[PDB]
Each structure stands twice: as C-alpha cells, then as structure tokens.
Amino acid sequence: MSEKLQKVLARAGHGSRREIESIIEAGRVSVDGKIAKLGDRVEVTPGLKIRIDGHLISVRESAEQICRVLAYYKPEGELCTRNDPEGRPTVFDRLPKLRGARWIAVGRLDVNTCGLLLFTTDGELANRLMHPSREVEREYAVRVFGQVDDAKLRDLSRGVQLEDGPAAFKTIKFSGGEGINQWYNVTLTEGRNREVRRLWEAVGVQVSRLIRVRYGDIPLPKGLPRGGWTELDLAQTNYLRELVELPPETS
C-alpha cells in the first residue's frame, strides 16, 4: 500500500510526475532523511518526512486528496500544455492559483478548437475520465459542409477506416441547418488526434466549425464566457466522480 514518490509530490503541487523524477534522479529528494532513488515508493502517513533540497513538503493520502474540478471554456489560441518550448499561450495561464495541489487537464483540445475542458486536482479522476476503458462521452457540436444522408450516418456509426485504424461515432444527431452548412452533435468515447474531423473527412465531409460541448456528465455551463472558468460545486464534482466509480466527497 504505497505510491511512487513522484506521484505523491506531483499531487502536492511540486511539479509534474516526470519533472519530479528528474529531481529524484539528481539526488535532491529524501524520505525520512535518506536520499530516495528513482522508483522508490512511499506510504503517506502523518509523520512521513519527504524533503526536496532539505525543505519539508506537506503531503496527503491519495484517497483523501483535494478534489476540485473546473469547467473551462477553452478559447482558440491556447495550448493544452504546462510547458510550451516556444512559450505560446496555454490553457493554464489564467486558472486560479493553487497551493498544495495543481490543476490537471482532463484530456487536451487542439489549439484552434474551442470548447469545454475540465481541470481537476485529482489525478485518479483525471485518468479515469480520459482513458477510453471507461468509455466516457465527449460531445461535440460540429458544423460541416458536404453531402450527408442516413447511409453516411450509418457508416459513421458502424465503423470507418481512419489512417490510424477503425473509428466510429457513438451517437450522431442532426441539430440544425445554417446556410450551406449543417450542424450535428456527435459523441466519441475515446480521444484520438483530430478524430472528429478525420471521421467526417473519411466519409467525404469537411468540418468548418468544431466545439466541445460536454465531457462526461458535465455540459459547457450556460453563460460561461469563452476563455472563462468556473468551479463545479460539490454535487457536480460528486456526480463526475460517480460516473467513473469513485466514492463521493463530503467536502
């Protein structure tokens, strides 16, 4: 009943897992006064003393960790990265400051794509939401141009061959016309690169606009400005946890 040291320290807000591995590898991290090595595990208990460069780090048990969730209306022009080699804007730039924890992005969006991005302090929740084993729904509003008929919708639902293998939309619903364009709401239960655009392209349809409008049981909040965040309340956080079989928080 233990965890890799870098998992614990990342949860505590002291860097990413792999960043922390570098610090461990450099002999800078100790447990109970003894230098830790890469791969070491610890069991968080009240008296455990983990230090980085001699400085004590306050840590928490995994199951008792802070589980906050934000809904963010990700705007075009921001990257889903914590460290862009080129220094371009990121989705983390305006999120509220946290100590003793950090925001984890639940998946990524393309820079030029708008829509809902969840963040959470709880990396178990994050992975359970992202990993396709639990088949969490991602819903997009898609504006397309091209011939579409029920046969095409059938093909997209039953599986088409993409460059990186078979893929299918889980649901597809016509949501309205506009000009020489139609809107559809579609869902996927995985998240391959540009998958929504590439599915439509595979059946000869081009995508002019693409907005992520729901992740799991959390819709893009009504009235949330583009580029704005809002924090989910306890009930909503618990609903999201329950979706991926995590127990509810009481706080």
Next chain:
RNA sequence: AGAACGUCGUGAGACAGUUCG
C-alpha cells in the same frame, strides 16, 4: 522525429492513454 500531463510500474517497461505541437 519536438513537447505536456495523468494512471500503472523498484526503473526494465506500460495504458482500450489524452481532439498536443
């Protein structure tokens, strides 16, 4: 082949990884 982040994993490697660039 340029990166990020989670999750497993005494470090060798992994995921039904994530709409990265």
